Design an enzyme around this catalytic site. Sequence first.
Site, short mmCIF file in Angstrom:
data_model
loop_
_atom_site.label_atom_id
_atom_site.label_comp_id
_atom_site.label_asym_id
_atom_site.label_seq_id
_atom_site.Cartn_x
_atom_site.Cartn_y
_atom_site.Cartn_z
N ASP A 181 -1.69 -8.82 9.88
CA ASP A 181 -1.93 -9.08 8.43
C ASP A 181 -2.94 -8.05 7.88
OD1 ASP A 181 -0.12 -11.24 8.16
OD2 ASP A 181 -1.65 -12.69 7.50
N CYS A 215 9.08 -2.26 3.89
CA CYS A 215 7.99 -3.19 4.16
C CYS A 215 7.84 -4.02 2.88
CB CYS A 215 6.74 -2.43 4.65
SG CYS A 215 6.27 -0.94 3.71
N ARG A 221 3.64 1.00 5.95
CA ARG A 221 4.28 0.87 7.28
C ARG A 221 5.58 1.69 7.31
NH1 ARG A 221 3.59 -5.77 7.63
NH2 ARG A 221 1.37 -5.72 7.01
N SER A 222 6.37 1.64 6.25
CA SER A 222 7.63 2.42 6.11
C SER A 222 7.34 3.92 6.30
CB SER A 222 8.27 2.15 4.74
OG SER A 222 8.77 0.79 4.62
N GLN A 262 -0.72 4.59 3.31
CA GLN A 262 -1.53 3.93 2.23
C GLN A 262 -3.04 3.93 2.55
OE1 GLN A 262 0.97 0.13 1.81
NE2 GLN A 262 0.07 0.34 -0.23
#
Length: 284
Positions: A181, A215, A221-222, A262
């Site tokens: 998370d 994602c 994450r992508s 990110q």
Amino acid sequence: MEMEKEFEQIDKSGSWAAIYQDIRHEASDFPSRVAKLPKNKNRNRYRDVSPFDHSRIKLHQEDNDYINASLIKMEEAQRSYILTQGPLPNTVGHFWEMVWEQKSRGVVMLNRVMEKGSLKCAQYWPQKEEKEMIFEDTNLKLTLISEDIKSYYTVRQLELENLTTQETREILHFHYTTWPDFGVPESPASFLNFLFKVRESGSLSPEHGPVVVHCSAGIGRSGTFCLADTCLLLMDKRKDPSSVDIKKVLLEMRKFRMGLIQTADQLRFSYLAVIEGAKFIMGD
Ligand SMILES: COC(=O)c1ccc(S(N)(=O)=O)cc1
């Protein structure tokens, strides 16, 4: 400069935040005018994440061709990816229309439907064999065929039927279920294992349309998934594997979709995955 040494140099100097801001500053800026039209406001999960007009995927319909999805075409690596947001309640039909029209074999999902107690994407695939889903707006039917649940990921076989022509195709769903998370995984071992399972399936290969990767926003994450794959492929292809510059590959990818990677922790994790994965690529 061998990235493993560049890595220890940034770590010992604790300059990850400084490298990351340098990338943010040099990144491409292209128009996203279609994404911002008022008719498209409920097709976007996040106001600050849009596809560029030049690389956006077009839906094959005259009504409204818009989806929040980008084509990332890596010329030297000979790989293509579609990066998209997690589908929303009013875009699940558009999502499966895109998979159909682009001739994709695989969908790569890097998030859970709920994280941090909030919904990060719609339940867009069926959970039981005997309860199929029909998308009436795009005329598609989706059935769960089989499910293989492992400790770090789940693989599903799905059947997508074009109800207009009664053609069917098998789609593979690769679901990485253990990204934490907050932050990034401590070791890249399970993420590299997952990437090798997608590759082994044929989903990334030139005989199919591009793999669909998502994602929640389709950039973080992508971004990590396609950056790691492309860097390891270039290290296989080139006479000098040390010539692979991860910061330059990331800037090339950012010509096609904004914001890929990110955080400074995601950048550091991308370096770790490529460095640990290369110890297979170079013959082990
Ligand atoms: C055809 O399927 C749907 O129309 C649909 C809509 C929304 C959701 S969701 N966002 O509540 O999970 C799931 C499925």
